């Protein structure tokens, strides 16, 4: 066949289309993903037939699926479908604009080439706008507090001339005629990144405003190079005359100032709706998170309206304009993320993000101090600065999953593609020990796992086997590179082992993670708590379905020296949770339903009442961390989604939190994002490096469309370089035609991944330079400051309720009050998004 | 399921087959690729059913598709289909020979297992032979100018004896009896690589000719080891007697000489058709390039007829025969490519290619100087020499794409699989800046991109952001590793930036690439030209759809100091070009068709008249380079195909060029291949390393079947080692059974890719040993000699017409003459080859 990579890929796309066609044929209302697959595949198939033009297929594509054949959200989510195919005249791109335009599609066309029977329209049996922006109906004034002038501008050219918002107006094409003197030090008072067009012979009046900051003109035609002053004005006018740039005095041109005044003729206004469309939302605006019920309100914005950094043709980030000429090369940002909505435990804000040497260098207003006010010296865009366009998007910290079983490499790819940039756990591959426990037991394996993962663009921490009553071997795995230890009942979680392991932790400044004695073999939960002896410990899957003292391990959530986490599969309590978990446990542990003792054990471990309590305890901040339990009892690609599904369920069933305002869900949002960002970093002792969008930390950052927030990110940035991202057909004319998949980027090739990341180890390991011993390219840093932590150090998740669990009925109470929530029948961040 | 890799692969093959079956079921005439998929899948399916033998399926496979169910070219292209499947008696290989043997196929069998309705034969509605060889009807004489003898040879053996063309005849199996004395220093006068068979008791007369060159006998039975002379003859005859090798004097055996004489009984002849079948074509023969209208004539051949280097059982490249024993080990070739048709800007020739230390060591006649005439000391095949079989194939230089946006890694794989071995451009991954511009802005990113790509078997050059009015930052990106700079309107392409960037280039000996001011914001095209100040500059997408002064950027093609390139999507003007491009632009730039100014801009940039002119300007050599614009506005896998589609269109609409002869298209072919080989290398300053099939340069070479020339190569050789190649089922008994895909080879594993390639940097970067600083394994070399270049230095593309563009109508003229060509409704190198 001699198949090229693109032919293999397009076959995959066609297969997805055919799946969507079969589903359509039985009356399934297609989701966004299925709709894209079907429409793109159909365009390819009509191209193969060779009877239809690109123009014809732009039209035909709008007739395939109607509103009745797709889910309610699809007409909102689906703005366009793009694909390239081999026409009789070669490869061409087709864009189908707004494809869901009718009530019912022409289903013979939707099923063309499939040989499937066309279903009657009555087969499709009978709302929320994902990622919607809410704003007040009001306009905003641009460029306030500046000198202004209105000038008549005439084109004497025979070809069109277009001038951008931040172009120095005296520097324009000599075939424009106007008062060049009055234009000196001025620029167009129009929305940032827009332009004014002059056709040959056109006269148009334009409003100009003064440049600000240092007021220095650079670039263009070098007519008026230098600081704005009287001497340089006269020099500029001499150059205008000598070089024949169009100039005519306009003595009576209106002059004034811009201000907060709806009636000022010098002002330019923009409605909040259009502002949000161009730059993303601003202060007071609200954003729906994915298809959840959660609304995030912008708390503050660093932008000065009119000076937004937007990159593109005729736009702001250009030489001498938004791109600075007046600064030392060494202080140029490496990359700027422009116009980001930042969602972080520290706040929900609007800002530019500066990246330098792989670190978050600055958060605030970026640009050029020579023409803009409010640009600090650490936010300068230079010639040597890359641009990532954040407008309309949400940026968060990379997620940190701190309950990883390293069972296979493929879970790493699933993790990063979901928005996780740090993994903490243990394992050696799919050995029984690892399939059961987060343990890398041997120094040999510690070396090999650090070497194995050295080129992967994630930060890694490996934990050894802490289940020993003697310190001797624990010292060895720690000096070999372990940054923590796991106590697991499968290796013995006895009071003797617990005490020894914690004594080791006190010496080594590492965190201990525990899966307790489910069997109550050596003691009940109170006896394990006693063995902690008030020392800091991280309790894994604190609810207990994932393991622990039956039935009351969840009591640890009220213990001050405990840092409690949840694993994912129980998040949140839904219709299928109990049936799924009970069978999973009995299959995994080879338990027989016919044997009374086996069933008794299973029922003692899988409990509706404690899982329901876990929903509430997460919501009130009594559980501090959410994690996967990857391929042992949890799902690596669902750390983020399960967190937001829990928050959504709790809002639906209890309303806003005590500390939330009436207008938004900001407090709940900040509390929940802390669970998979900052708190895993604090618990494990590397919070100075990662875990939040804050200056000085690694630029591990994830870009989200609001409509896909919490499910499928756009782009994963690791140490300031794109590591993974959505990209379409590699042969295509543009990056967006189908099939669009999450794919590894340049941060995954060669040794680039190591340059962008950190392997976290113990101080003991770093003291012996384990990176040198093992020949690692990845930076290594020691974990620290984990032995004086309490629940109070868990950001926004510091609650310590007195927890009681009835030993017979399993009823859970917090401070004497019943902790109960109903099962949810549905969750968001699911059916709208996934192909399977 | 426990799926092995081959099971996953065969599922993919089956899916391709089912796609072909659905298409067949609606009456589609299948292309080559679809036909292979269907036939192979059907053989697998009948194997699964377990009722048919291998022998039965060899027959059944010939009945599936008739001539009416496939495209006209398919019976020509499809010589065999091979696949392996699990029969009841295990894995077996089936080869279906000449599968399109009937007018109509047995379509129930073609659709067996699919459950699809069988279409009536009237559903298939109603020529060029791709890659055909044309030759004169005449024979060629082998081995002329040699002593000859005819000897009776009798077998006294009880088992068969077969003797190859270049075996020293006195050294044959002692159970052959003949005149051993008259056989001394002789070999069979038969086509190179053929053999004569002797069954037990057979007597056959054979014609022998003298060995030539140094006339030294080596190997065999060591009967007659040494130079051919009287002393060694007597020694040989003593050995014949002592060891009992069959000998009988034939006193009256006819003796003479070979010569140019059709009546000489000592001569052996071969028809040009059979010669071409065995060795590829020779001088005067013609080859159709793919399914295009272009005919390449062999201009000269280095072969001496009869001494062709062919490798295989009983063939020429064997110890003491075509494989030399008389030379120092150090001068053995590493690899020989045998019997190649070389297509290069320097000429269309037939030769062997010698490779040593990853370089093209020699081009000419290879072999063994001890038995062949005309073998120079740099073309010796030794024991330590690998063989690549070039007979019947075309070899070209690896393509060089010098307009690459490094948006994702996957475009690199698409590029090499299409026949590209050098990439030049800029980027950091899918950041907005890179999606828009060929720029790697930060020294941090320059380091990371060089490190990221270090193990990939392509040569790379990275360009920084040249859009600055000050030199300071430009110096820094250059010393960091940039081998060029891009001026782009999105960062500002103002006269001030242009002038500064060029001054920097004059100092650093690097090339400047420019995307000009489309908006005419700072000036019209003449003002940008003025800013060049006569200095060398590379104009990207010179026609302007990809960007530039509206509407007349194309004027640069007549400027002496401009080196102009085209990007691909406009190549050539076809029925769908304008509709496709207009919508692409408006989608990408968020332009509204309802807004008059937006539509006016779009129409000013996408112009039928200038794209038509671009066809003609390429044909007359006024545009010198073709490039991709990968994923920004062009297609990385179509640099080569779009070049040949342009040439084909222009031949169809204007006939042969002025400088072309009446009998072939050699001049046009050489002009066009220069556009993606030598000229990108000259423009960017690394032409001493790559860009043509010439001695001393890197052995970056691509092997093509003539029938697939310009679309899908067989094999991509990087620095003398196979990097990518067509390979079938990895579990199969042979390399050819389905699915055959372009796959990465050993040149892509470990650090092999770096050993085979070069990262091109500036002299400034090399002066500081950036390869050492960055820990690169790939060789680094400095670009040079780019600041004194003019259009006259662009090989076979040095035309400087005076170009005018009407500002109102967009009419383009060259030297006062209209430049117009019609739209093409179809292109070659498309529908015959691609699955989608
Ligand atoms: Ni556990
Ligand atoms: Ni676990
Ligand atoms: Ni461009
Ligand atoms: Ni480009």
Swiss-Prot record, chains A, B:
Entries under Gene3D superfamilies matching the protein: Metal-dependent hydrolases, Urease, beta subunit, Urease, gamma-like subunit, Urease, subunit C, domain 1
Alphabetical list of Pfam families matching this protein: Amidohydro_1, Urease_alpha, Urease_beta, Urease_gamma, Urease_linker
Protein name: Urease
Modified residues (N6-carboxylysine): 486
Organism: Canavalia ensiformis
Enzyme kind, highest EC tier: hydrolase
Catalytic activity, EC: 3.5.1.5
Keyword set includes Hydrolase: yes
GO molecular function list: nickel cation binding; toxin activity; urease activity
Cofactor: Ni cation
Post-translational modification, as annotated: Carboxylation allows a single lysine to coordinate two nickel ions.
Miscellaneous comment in the UniProt entry for this protein: Was isolated in 1926 by James B. Sumner. It was the first enzyme ever obtained in a crystalline form, demonstrating that enzymes could be proteins.
Catalytic residue positions: 589 (proton donor)
HAMAP family referenced in this protein's UniProt entry, alphabetically: Urease_alpha
């Amino acid at each position: 066949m001699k198949l090229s990579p693109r032919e293999v890929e397009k076959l995959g796309l066609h297969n997805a289309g055919y799946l969507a066609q079969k589903r359509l044929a039985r009356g399934v209302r297609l989701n966004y993903t299925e709709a894209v697959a079907l429409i793109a595949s159909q365009i390819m198939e009509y191209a193969r037939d060779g009877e239809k033009t690109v123009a014809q297929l732009m039209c035909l594509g709008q007739h395939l699926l109607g509103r009745r054949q797709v889910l309610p959200a699809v007409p909102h989510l689906l703005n366009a479908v793009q694909v390239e195919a081999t026409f009789p005249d070669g490869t061409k791109l087709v864009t189908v604009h707004d494809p869901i335009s009718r009530e019912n599609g022409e289903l013979q066309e939707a099923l063309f080439g499939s040989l499937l029977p066309v279903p009657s329209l009555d087969k499709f049996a009978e709302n929320r706008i994902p990622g919607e922006i809410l704003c007040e109906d009001e306009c905003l004034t641009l460029n306030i507090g500046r000198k202004a002038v209105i000038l008549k501008v005439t084109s004497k050219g025979d070809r069109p001339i277009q001038v951008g918002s931040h172009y120095h107006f005296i520097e324009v094409n000599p075939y424009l005629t106007f008062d060049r003197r009055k234009a000196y030090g001025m620029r167009l008072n129009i929305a940032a990144g827009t332009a004014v067009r002059f056709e040959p012979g056109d006269c148009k009046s334009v409003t100009l405003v003064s440049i600000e900051g240092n007021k220095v003109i650079r670039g263009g035609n070098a007519i008026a190079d230098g600081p704005v002053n009287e001497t340089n004005l006269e020099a500029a006018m001499h150059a205008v005359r000598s070089k024949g740039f169009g100039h005519e005095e306009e003595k009576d041109a209106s002059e004034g100032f811009t201000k907060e005044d709806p009636n000022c003729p010098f002002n330019t206004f923009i409605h909040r709706k259009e502002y949000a469309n161009k730059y993303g939302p601003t202060t007071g605006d609200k954003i729906r998170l994915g298809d959840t019920n959660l609304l995030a309100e912008i708390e503050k914005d660093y932008a000065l309206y009119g000076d937004e950094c937007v990159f593109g043709g005729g736009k702001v980030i250009r030489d001498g304009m938004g791109q600075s000429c007046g600064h030392p090369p060494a202080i140029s940002l490496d990359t700027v993320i422009t116009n980001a909505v930042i969602i972080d435990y520290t706040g929900i804000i609007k800002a530019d993000i500066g990246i330098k040497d792989g670190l978050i260098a600055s958060i605030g207003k970026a640009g050029n101090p020579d023409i803009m006010n409010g640009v600090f010296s650490n936010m300068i865009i230079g010639a040597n600065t890359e641009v990532i366009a954040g407008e309309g998007l949400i940026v968060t910290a990379g997620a940190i999953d701190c309950h990883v079983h390293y069972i296979c490499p493929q879970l790493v790819y699933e993790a990063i593609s979901s928005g996780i940039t740090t993994l903490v756990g243990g394992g050696t591959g799919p050995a029984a020990g690892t399939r059961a426990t987060t343990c890398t037991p041997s120094p040999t394996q510690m070396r090999l796992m650090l070497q194995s993962t050295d080129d992967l663009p994630l930060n890694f921490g490996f934990t050894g086997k802490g289940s020993s009553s003697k310190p001797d071997e624990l010292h060895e795995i720690i000096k070999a590179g372990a940054m923590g230890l796991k106590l697991h009942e499968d290796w013995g979680s006895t009071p003797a082992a617990i005490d020894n392991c914690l004594t080791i932790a006190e010496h080594h400044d590492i965190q201990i993670n525990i899966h307790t004695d489910t069997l109550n073999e050596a003691g009940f939960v109170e006896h394990s708590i006693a063995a902690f002896k008030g020392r800091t410990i991280h309790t894994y899957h604190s609810e207990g379905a994932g393991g622990g003292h039956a039935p009351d391990i969840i009591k640890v959530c009220g213990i001050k020296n405990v840092l409690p986490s949840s694993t994912n599969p129980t998040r949140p309590l839904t219709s299928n949770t109990i049936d799924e978990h009970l069978d999973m446990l009995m299959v995994c542990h080879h338990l027989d339903r016919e044997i009374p003792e086996d069933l008794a054990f299973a029922h003692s471990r899988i409990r509706k009442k404690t899982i329901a309590a876990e929903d509430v305890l997460n919501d009130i901040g009594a559980i501090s961390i959410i994690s996967s339990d990857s391929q042992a009892m949890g799902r690596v690609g669902e750390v983020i989604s399960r967190t937001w599904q829990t928050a959504d369920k709790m809002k639906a069933q209890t309303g806003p939190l005590k500390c939330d305002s009436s207008d938004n869900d900001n407090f709940r949002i900040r509390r929940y994002i802390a669970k998979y960002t900052i708190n895993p970093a604090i618990a494990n002792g590397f919070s100075q490096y990662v875990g939040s969008v804050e200056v000085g930390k690694l630029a591990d950052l994830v870009m989200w469309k609001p409509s896909f927030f919490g499910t499928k990110p756009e782009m994963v940035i690791k140490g300031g370089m794109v590591a993974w991202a959505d990209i379409g057909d590699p042969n295509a004319s543009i990056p967006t035609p189908e099939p669009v998949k999450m794919r590894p980027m340049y941060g995954t090739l060669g040794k680039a991944g190591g340059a962008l990341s950190i392997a976290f180890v113990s101080k003991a390991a770093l003291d012996q330079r384990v990176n040198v011993l093992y020949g690692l390219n990845k930076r290594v840093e020691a974990v620290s400051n984990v032995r004086k932590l309490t629940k109070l150090d868990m950001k926004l998740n510091d609650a310590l309720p007195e927890i009681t669990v009835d030993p017979e009925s399993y009823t859970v109470k917090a401070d004497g009050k019943l902790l109960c929530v109903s099962e949810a029948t549905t969750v968001p961040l699911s059916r709208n998004y996934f192909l399977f």
